């Protein structure tokens, strides 16, 4: 959700997203998320799966 | 066109002969190689497993 004035100001000045990080940091973060999910799934499978 | 027109080619041939016959009389001795070593590794980032 965004209001009309903010969107108009964004579009008038021709803004675009910009970043200073590299590709590998993002994929490392995604791998961390997947690892957390895998850890929880393994714990549930070895303790709670009944 | 006389014998003067052949001076530069004469010098070329003379330089070639001087180099060739100075190579013949030069004394040649084997040298010891002292640089053998296994120091040419490659780096990079490890492909660590996730799980």
Q: A30: which residues sit within 8 A by CB, 6+ positions away?
A: none
For residue B16, give Cα distances in angstroms to A1, A30, B4, B21. 86, 70, 20, 9
For residue A16, give Cα distances in angstroms to A7, A8, A19. 12, 14, 10
- Of A33, A19, A23, the residue nearest B45 (C-alpha): A23
Residues from chain A contacting residue B51 (CB–CB below 8 Å): 35, 38
- A6-43 as b/e, with b when 16 or more CB fall inside 10 Å? eeeeeeeeeeeeeeeeeeeeeeeeeeeeeeeeeeeeee
- Rg over CA atoms, chain A: 20
B46 touches chain A (CB under 8 A): no
Which technique was the structure solved with, according to the deposited record? cryo-EM
- Provide the CB-side half-sphere exposure for B37 (13 A, CA): 5
Q: Which residue has the tokens 């590794």?
A: B41
Report whether A31 contacts B50 (CB < 8 A).
yes
Residues from chain A contacting residue B47 (CB–CB below 8 Å): none
Report whether A34 contacts B50 (CB < 8 A).
yes
């Amino acid at each position: 959700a965004v209001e009309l004035e903010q969107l108009a100001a964004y579009g008038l000045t021709g803004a675009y997203p910009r970043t200073n990080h590299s590709v590998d940091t993002i994929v490392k973060t995604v791998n961390n998320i997947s690892a957390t999910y895998s850890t929880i799934a393994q714990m549930l499978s070895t303790i709670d799966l009944d | 066109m006389a014998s003067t027109t052949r001076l530069v080619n004469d010098r070329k041939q003379l330089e070639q002969q001087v180099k060739d016959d100075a190579r013949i009389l030069a004394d040649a001795r084997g040298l010891n190689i002292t640089t053998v070593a296994n120091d040419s590794a490659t780096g990079g980032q490890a492909i660590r497993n996730v799980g």
